[PDB]
Structure formats: C-alpha cells, structure tokens
Amino acid sequence: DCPVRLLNPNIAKMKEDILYHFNLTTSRHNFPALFGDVKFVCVGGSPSRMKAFIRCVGAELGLDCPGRDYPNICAGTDRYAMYKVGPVLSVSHGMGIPSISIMLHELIKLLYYARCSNVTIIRIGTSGGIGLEPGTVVITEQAVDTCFKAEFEQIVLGKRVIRKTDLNKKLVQELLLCSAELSEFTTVVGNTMCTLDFYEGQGRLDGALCSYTEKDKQAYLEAAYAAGVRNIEMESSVFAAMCSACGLQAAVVCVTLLNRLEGDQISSPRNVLSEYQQRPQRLVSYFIKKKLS
Amino acid sequence: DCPVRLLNPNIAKMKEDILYHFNLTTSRHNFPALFGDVKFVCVGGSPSRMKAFIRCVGAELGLDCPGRDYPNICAGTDRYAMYKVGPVLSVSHGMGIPSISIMLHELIKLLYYARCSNVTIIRIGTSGGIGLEPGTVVITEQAVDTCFKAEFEQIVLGKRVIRKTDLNKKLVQELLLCSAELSEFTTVVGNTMCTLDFYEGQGRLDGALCSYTEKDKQAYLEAAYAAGVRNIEMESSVFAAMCSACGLQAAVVCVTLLNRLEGDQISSPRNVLSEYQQRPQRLVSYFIKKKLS
Ligand SMILES: O=c1[nH]c(=O)n(COCCO)cc1Cc1ccccc1
Numbered sequence: 027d028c029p030v031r032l033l034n035p036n037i038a039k040m041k042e043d044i045l046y047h048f049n050l051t052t053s054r055h056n057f058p059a060l061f062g063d064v065k066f067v068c069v070g071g072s073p074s075r076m077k078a079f080i081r082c083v084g085a086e087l088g089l090d091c092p093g094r095d096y097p098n099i100c101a102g103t104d105r106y107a108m109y110k111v112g113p114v115l116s117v118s119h120g121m122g123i124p125s126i127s128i129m130l131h132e133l134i135k136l137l138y139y140a141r142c143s144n145v146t147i148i149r150i151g152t153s154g155g156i157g158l159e160p161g162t163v164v165i166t167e168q169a170v171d172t173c174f175k176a177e178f179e180q181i182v183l184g185k186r187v188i189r190k191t192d193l194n195k196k197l198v199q200e201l202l203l204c205s206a207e208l209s210e211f212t213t214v215v216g217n218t219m220c221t222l223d224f225y226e227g228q229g230r231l232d233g234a235l236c237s238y239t240e241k242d243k244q245a246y247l248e249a250a251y252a253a254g255v256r257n258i259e260m261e262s263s264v265f266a267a268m269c270s271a272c273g274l275q276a277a278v279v280c281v282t283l284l285n286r287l288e289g290d291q292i293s294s295p296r297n298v299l300s301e302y303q304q305r306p307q308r309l310v311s312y313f314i315k316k317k318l319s
Numbered sequence: 320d321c322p323v324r325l326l327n328p329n330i331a332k333m334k335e336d337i338l339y340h341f342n343l344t345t346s347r348h349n350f351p352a353l354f355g356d357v358k359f360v361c362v363g364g365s366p367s368r369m370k371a372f373i374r375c376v377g378a379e380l381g382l383d384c385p386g387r388d389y390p391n392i393c394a395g396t397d398r399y400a401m402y403k404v405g406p407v408l409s410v411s412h413g414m415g416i417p418s419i420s421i422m423l424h425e426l427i428k429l430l431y432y433a434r435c436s437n438v439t440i441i442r443i444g445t446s447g448g449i450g451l452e453p454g455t456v457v458i459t460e461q462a463v464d465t466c467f468k469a470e471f472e473q474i475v476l477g478k479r480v481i482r483k484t485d486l487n488k489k490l491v492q493e494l495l496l497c498s499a500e501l502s503e504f505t506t507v508v509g510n511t512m513c514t515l516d517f518y519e520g521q522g523r524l525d526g527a528l529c530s531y532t533e534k535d536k537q538a539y540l541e542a543a544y545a546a547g548v549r550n551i552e553m554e555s556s557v558f559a560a561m562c563s564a565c566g567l568q569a570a571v572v573c574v575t576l577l578n579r580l581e582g583d584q585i586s587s588p589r590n591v592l593s594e595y596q597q598r599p600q601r602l603v604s605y606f607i608k609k610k611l612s
Pocket residue numbers: 071121151152153154155224228258259260283284290291292339
C-alpha cells in the first residue's frame with residue numbers, strides 16, 4: 027500500500043551504499059531478509075531504554091524470548107544501537123538534532139532498501155514540562171521551535187532552509203485512546219518545543235553559563251505555555267520535518283520529569299523517576315500489541 | 320595558575336548539584352579528592368575511542384595495568400562514558416553541537432567543583448577533508464561557521480546570541496611542534512568548519528533527502544577552501560566558545576577520512592581507515608607524555 031520513499035535522485039545511481047553509523051552495507055547485508063517485515067519503528071535517546079523497549083514488546087507480543095537475548099544489530103559500532111523483534115525495530119538516537127538527523131537519514135534508507143511499507147515511527151523520550159505535574163505523558167500535537175512555530179530551520183550550502191513540521195493527527199488519537207484504556211498515568215496532548223541546548227537553550231539557571239535572571243526565564247516559559255507549549259526536549263522538530271516528507275506516519279510520546287515552572291533539577295526519588303521513565307515505553311508497546319492483535 | 324571558572328552566579332546558591340548526564344552528584348561524590356589532580360581532558364564522539372584513548376595515554380605515562388579494565392566513571396547511565404588515568408580524563412560526547420554542549424556544561428561544573436586549575440582540553444575526532452589527502456591530521460586554527468567566520472550563534476530565551484570562537488594559539492603551536500617531532504603522518508594547521516547536520520548540512524549527495532546538485536555542493540566546498548577551511552566536522556564551534564569562556568585552554572585535533580572534493584564516501588580500505596582513526600589519539604597522547612615529563 028504505502029512504500030517508504032526517499033527524496034534523493036542520487037540514490038538510484040549508486041552501485042552500493044554504506045549506512046556508516048549502523049555498520050550495515052548493501053554489499054554485505056540482505057536488507058529485505060533482515061527488515062522487510064518491519065511495520066513499527068520506535069526510537070529514543072538512550073540505548074539501554076531501547077533494549078528495554080524491545081524486551082517489553084517481545085513479552086507483550088508473546089513473541090517472547092524467555093531466558094534469552096536480543097542481539098544489537100549494530101554490533102561493531104557504538105554510534106547507535108538497534109534491535110528487532112518481529113515487525114518491530116527499536117533504534118537509539120543519542121541527544122540533539124544532529125544525532126537523530128544522522129540516524130533518520132540512515133534509517134529511512136534501510137527501510138527503503140528493505141522494501142518496507144506502511145511503517146509507523148514513534149519517538150519515545152523524556153522532557154521538561156511547563157505547567158504539568160511531573161510524570162505527565164505528553165503526546166505531541168505540533169513540534170515547534172524557540173519562537174513556538176511549527177518549523178524546522180537548517181543551513182544548506184550556506185542558505186537558510188525551512189521545513190514545516192508534521193505529525194499524524196490520527197496517530198495522536200490512537201495513542202490517546204490507548205492511554206485512556208490503560209489509565210496508568212495522566213496523558214495530555216500539546217505542543218513540544220525543540221531546542222539545541224539543554225541549559226541556556228531551555229532557560230535553566232544551573233548551567234556552567236547563564237546570562238539571564240530567574241524572572242527572565244520565567245517570562246520565557248510562560249510565553250511558551252500561552253502559545254500551547256507543554257513540554258521541552260531536543261529531537262522533535264527534525265524528526266517531524268523528515269518523517270512526513272518520506273512517507274512515514276510519525277508520533278512523539280515523551281514523559282515529563284519535572285515541572286520547569288518550579289525549577290531545573292529532578293526532585294523525584296529514584297524509584298519514582300524509574301517509573302516515569304518507562305511510561306512512554308508502556309504506552310507504545312501497548313499500542314503496538316493492540317495493532318498486531 | 321588559572322582555575323576553572325563558571326559564568327553563573329546561581330551555582331554558589333545551590334546546596335547540591337546533580338550532573339544528571341554523568342550520574343554524579345555533589346552530595347554523593349567528593350569532587351576535590353576524585354578529580355582534583357586533573358590537568359588534561361581529552362573528548363571525542365565515540366565511547367570506544369575514548370576508552371582506547373585512556374588505555375593509550377595510560378601506557379605512555381607508565382601507568383598501565385595489564386589485565387585491569389579502566390572503569391567507566393559514568394556507570395549507571397549510558398548518556399556519556401568517562402575514564403581516568405592519573406591527571407588525564409577521557410570523556411565521550413556523542414555527535415553534534417547539542418550533545419557535546421550538555422557534556423561541556425557538566426564537565427566544566429565537575430572541574431570547578433574539583434578545584435582544578437591549569438586544565439587543557441583537547442577534542443579528538445574525525446572529519447571530512449577539503450583539498451587534503453585522506454588521513455591528514457588537522458590541528459584547528461579557528462573553528463568557523465557556514466559563512467566561514469569564527470563565530471558560534473545560539474538561541475537564548477528565543478533570542479539570537481553570537482559568541483566568538485577561540486582556540487588557544489599557544490596550544491596549537493605546541494601540538495604542531497609535537498607533530499613535527501613525531502613525524503608519523505601528514506599534519507596541517509587550518510580552519511575547521513562546524514555544521515549542525517551531516518548529510519544536507521555538509522552537502523553530501525547520499526542522504527535520504529537531497530535538495531541540490533553535485534555542481535552546487537562542489538562550488539560551495541570550493542568557496543570554503545578559498546576561505547581557509549580545510550576540514551568539516553560537527554562540534555568544534557560550541558567547544559571553542561564554551562572552553563575559552565570558562566578558562567580552559569582548548570584545542571581540536573581531527574583526522575580526515577576522505578577528501579570531499581572527490582566525493583562523499585570513504586574509498587580507503589577499512590584496514591587503512593582503522594590506522595587513520597588512531598592518528599589524533601597518537602598525537603595527543605604523545606603531547607600529554609611530553610607535557611608531563
Ligand atoms: O528538561 C528536560 N529537557 C530536555 O530536553 N530533556 C530532554 O531529554 C534530554 C536528555 O536528558 C529532558 C528534560 C528533563 C530533565 C530534567 C532534569 C535533568 C534531566 C532531564
């Protein structure tokens with residue numbers, strides 16, 4: 027029905043291709059054999075979260091592997107980790123726009139080389155909330171920039187280029203339905219601001235550098251809230267800009283680890299934080315199992 | 320004798336500080352005892368390279384423990400890895416400005432809490448060459464942007480802020496003298512262009528997306544070269560800006576994996592690429608040995 031597509035005429039003309047940061051090559055690896063059956067891709071910053079994710083899905087799907095292991099498909103490199111259980115692939119992306127951008131360029135080409143179709147991609151992550159209790163799960167409506175607009179900007183051969191951000195509306199509704207059925211945590215739908223710096227780029231007072239006042243950053247966070255922003259993270263704008271352009275249905279599901287209107291460091295005890303950290307995995311693995319049921 | 324400094328008044332008012340992405344805190348770790356002897360810090364993208372680096376410099380210094388693991392000081396998290404031997408720290412930083420930015424805010428705080436002084440910090444890494452033979456090591460003179468200027472722009476509370484990039488001129492000279500004495504590979508001094516992204520951000524033709532022609536990327540690379548740029552990477556601009564601000568003497572030493580005027584993928588056999596990858600490590604460990612003897 028809907029094949030993954032690239033927006034690059036040069037790919038067709040290449041004899042072989044190397045997915046440098048995955049250590050996978052079309053000369054050595056049989057892409058349709060390895061990945062042709064992939065229907066769900068889940069991505070997140072931490073390699074150990076992504077392995078925890080695949081194990082969670084394994085057990086949900088009863089495709090479980092009880093007493094046994096999920097090999098890292100990227101063994102041989104440590105730029106990203108990658109795991110697979112049935113039609114589900116789990117991929118780490120590190121932190122920040124450039125780190126996920128590289129992963130996405132290589133992932134989208136793998137999916138294309140695998141002859142994948144009807145792929146859903148969901149980012150699971152963590153975030154700072156604005157005016158939400160800690161632990162709230164946010165399903166992103168729009169991924170927005172530091173002016174609270176639905177855009178991703180980058181420089182390409184010296185020229186400022188802008189792409190619109192786009193997340194599948196129907197997917198947001200499907201995820202919300204799952205969350206209501208689960209009833210295990212508060213879930214809200216709102217806008218997610220994506221920044222390039224975690225400290226000064228998100229109005230923190232605890233960096234090595236801070237050129238502004240508590241009152242300054244508070245006015246900034248309030249202005250974000252008024253424009254519909256509910257959480258803050260570092261990957262969502264390029265993720266939304268790229269995935270739509272390539273024929274993938276995409277969502278972003280992040281848990282808030284603190285309320286930024288009240289401060290900058292996490293004051294949840296360790297057991298409570300571990301619980302928050304598995305909420306996006308819980309929702310998404312539940313959602314996948316539903317789809318495969 | 321120059322202590323590490325912070326540009327943030329709020330730090331003195333905090334009772335404790337958690338370096339979230341290192342899994343270290345000031346209440347649970349005696350930073351002066353643990354890190355107080357640090358005089359050199361080497362940073363790079365890959366944790367496995369940074370572990371290889373510490374093993375290398377440990378042997379140079381006569382501190383090597385045949386049959387002992389170097390422990391990861393950041394055990395408990397997988398955001399970054401960190402290793403130590405005597406007065407040398409090795410820290411991974413992942414890929415891109417945001418990822419290294421997080422690491423540098425926390426590292427500079429750590430060095431401050433440890434009461435370190437006269438610290439030298441050197442980034443080792445890989446790069447795309449412009450008009451250099453593959454495997455050439457570039458000691459960066461100025462870290463430049465896509466206009467080819469020695470500036471780093473960031474958004475702070477929705478506002479553009481421009482900072483100067485400053486790499487220590489004396490340290491460049493010392494690394495150049497070291498390279499001439501070692502005489503194990505071609506070493507040049509030149510400018511290094513720092514881009515946000517890797518595929519379209521560096522004019523490659525092999526991404527999932529590509530908006531320009533081979534001719535247009537070639538012209539842009541030629542304009543970079545005419546402006547003094549000899550290599551291209553993804554972290555030098557923010558590294559230079561932050562380190563100079565906080566009183567660390569900083570330098571960047573990268574190896575070129577290809578010449579981008581010839582194309583975008585590595586023609587080098589993998590055994591050769593493996594020798595190239597070890598060259599910045601070789602130079603900097605040698606430099607540290609000289610400095611400490
Ligand atoms: O405020 C945040 N902002 C943010 O971009 N994230 C993004 O996930 C980034 C890696 O920690 C996560 C948080 C929550 C947080 C708060 C304090 C310490 C660590 C993480």
